[PDB]
Amino acid sequence: SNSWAVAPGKTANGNALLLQNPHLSWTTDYFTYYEAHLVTPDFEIYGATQIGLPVIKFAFNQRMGITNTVNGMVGATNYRLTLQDGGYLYDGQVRPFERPQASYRLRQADGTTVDKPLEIRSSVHGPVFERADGTAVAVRVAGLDRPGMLEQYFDMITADSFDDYEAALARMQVPTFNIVYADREGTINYSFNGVAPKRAEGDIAFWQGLVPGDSSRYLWTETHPLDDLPRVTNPPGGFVQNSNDPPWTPTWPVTYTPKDFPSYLAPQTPHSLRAQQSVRLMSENDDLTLERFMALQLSHRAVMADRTLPDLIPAALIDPDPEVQAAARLLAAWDREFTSDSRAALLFEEWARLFAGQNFAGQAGFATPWSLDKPVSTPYGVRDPKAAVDQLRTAIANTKRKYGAIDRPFGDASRMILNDVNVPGAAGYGNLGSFRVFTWSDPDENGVRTPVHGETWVAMIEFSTPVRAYGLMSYGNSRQPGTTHYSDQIERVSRADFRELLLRREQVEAAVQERTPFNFKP
Amino acid sequence: QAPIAAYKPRSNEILWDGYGVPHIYGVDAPSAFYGYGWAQARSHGDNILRLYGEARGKGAEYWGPDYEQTTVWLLTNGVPERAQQWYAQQSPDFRANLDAFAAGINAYAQQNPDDISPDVRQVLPVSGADVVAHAHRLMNFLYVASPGRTLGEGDPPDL
């Protein structure tokens, strides 16, 4: 997921800009986004949310809007228990388990149900599970005593002012997420939000792993308030961003460092190339219009090619294999963009799979490692050019096997297909540097692949008066069998042809195709 | 400079555009929430009912062994019972919005039963507490604490 917010001083017209840009599965039901607009005499909200939620996660209106990305807030601890004598060892004593015999019903092949026993065991930590390997693990989840999640989120997106928004946020009822904000008064904010236990010791990696479950030393009981957590408001750089990176370059210049926060809140790992691009695209551009903001969102640079090809091409042209040399020249002639017409991109992906692992996150192949001192220009170079060329020899084979040739057009193999609409793809893997993301599937038997994950709801908003906003939803607004509103937007996505989002009554009245009158009596 | 004059709805209605986007106008908040539940049931009713059933702890009961691991996960972490508590613990005003949302789903289903798939009909009616429950499973027991991280397992979704 990506999120940008831009202060008035950084724009042509003097109104803040906001980007909503969740990246999630195109199939997983609970991750499905739905667009809607609610209006009463006392509030207005427009935006997208995950189905079954009664509040809009990605909301905006005439005054404000917000967006989210995943921060991995470590809100839970898995403790490894030490089993002894039917209890568990804890502070040097055998402590017995709390246990109830619960039960549930299971539907059988023939339509009936049988009752199945379910023992629920609990330690002081929380409920207990047995892993397949026989390890006893207790899960302790924070903020189980926070019933107000939905109301907080509702009060956030209907806030009459930034202060009202901060007060709502401060209730600590939303247990995770980075949250970016902007409004027509000109305020922008980034918050690394969630419910984080107060711990006396240990770094994030320690608290992500199995914590020893034999001691009260590791049993936390309190959580951090908002003002302990990384936040940025109206920074000098005039913008904020998050692309799932650690919260250490949320703007440029930064306003804090990792040492200002307990080490368990957030990792200090290399920032992905997509995140490096997020920072560059905002920091390097000034006097932004909504239109140029939208154009920047479409960025699809193979940043990894920029970091590796300077070293890889020469080393590869040395090799005796004429197939290796030809692959090196095809790659050298490429503009390093993930366009539909690219004959080199697929081959590049295949090389990068081996040079950086299947996730494209591996750092070991680089000459110069990542550095927070040069956070958008590292890591860089090829450490072992000879090995990287052997990796290229393999990638040549893999690319021919997968796609039929080393020079198949990117958008001929990469398609977006819903129902009977079939359109050429562009952009791709975030970890290769593409800001706009389509996480292409493995290819089928004919070398055709489609998105499993990426752009879904995309909206960009200027807090002018009235506001101006544009959006698209990759998989349409409905998934009910037979609907016309599943595949009816993906063509527009392939051309980046964004819909104008209609907030004002008169616009809605001009666009209306169906009236459902209802009435509610409780 | 003030924002534009807010619109004041005089009747309850959904105006749908050509892309299937509902613009829900309510004369008050429970009305708009009811409209939103109605629209969501129209656009996504089957999968919302499936998920609501799962968050009740009833996925195994309703749909069998493919749903059984999620059921064990949620009952063991007390999700369905805790959701009832979060529900009772709501402020009156917001609770009324949640009841309305759920009433909107129920109403859509009741008025368009051809549109609800057989295997999810047993889920109806849904309540304010089902809405709270699904949000709790989603926030705390899919996002914050995934069953995979606790059970020592493969990747998140399933495919």
Gyration radius of chain B, to the nearest Å?
A: 18 Å
Global shape of chain B = globular
Distance from first to last alpha carbon of chain B:
51 Å
Radius of gyration of chain A: 26 Å
CATH topology of chain B: Penicillin Amidohydrolase, domain 1
| Proportion in β-strands of chain A | 25-35%
Q: How many strand elements of chain B?
A: 2
Give the overall shape of chain A, derived from the CA principal axes: globular
Total helices of chain B: the number is 7
Helical/strand content category of chain A: alpha+beta
In CATH, what is the homologous superfamily of chain B?
A: Penicillin Amidohydrolase, domain 1
Q: What is the name of the CATH topology of the largest domain in chain A?
A: Glutamine Phosphoribosylpyrophosphate, subunit 1, domain 1
Spell out the key features of this protein:
A: alpha+beta, Glutamine Phosphoribosylpyrophosphate, subunit 1, domain 1, Penicillin G acylase, beta-roll domain, Penicillin amidase (Acylase) alpha subunit, N-terminal domain, 3 domains, globular, B: about 160 residues, mainly alpha, Penicillin Amidohydrolase, domain 1, hydrolase, autoproteolysis, precursor activation, intermediate structure
Summarize the structure.
The complex is a heterodimer of chains A (522) and B (159). Chain A is of the alpha+beta class.
Could you please describe the fold and organization of this structure?
The complex is a heterodimer of chains A (522) and B (159). Chain A is an alpha+beta fold and 522 residues long. Chain A is built from 12 helices and 30 strands. In chain A, strands 20-1-2-27-28-29 form a 6-stranded antiparallel sheet. A 4-stranded antiparallel sheet of chain A has the order 7-16-17-19, with no helix packed on it. A 4-stranded mixed sheet of chain A has the order 14-15-8-18. In chain A, helix 6 (303-317) packs antiparallel against helix 7 (322-332) and helix 6 crosses helix 9. The two termini of chain A are 39 Å apart. Chain B is mainly alpha-helical and 159 residues long. Chain B has a single domain (1-159), classed as Penicillin Amidohydrolase, domain 1, CATH 1.10.439.10. Helix content of chain B is 58%, strand content 5%. In chain B, a hairpin with a 5-residue loop joins strand 1 (13-16) and strand 2. At the A-B interface, strand 4, strand 12, strand 13, strand 15 and helix 1 of A face strand 1, strand 2, helix 1, helix 2 and helix 3 of B. Strand 30 (514-517) of chain A pairs antiparallel with strand 1 of chain B, so a sheet runs across the interface.
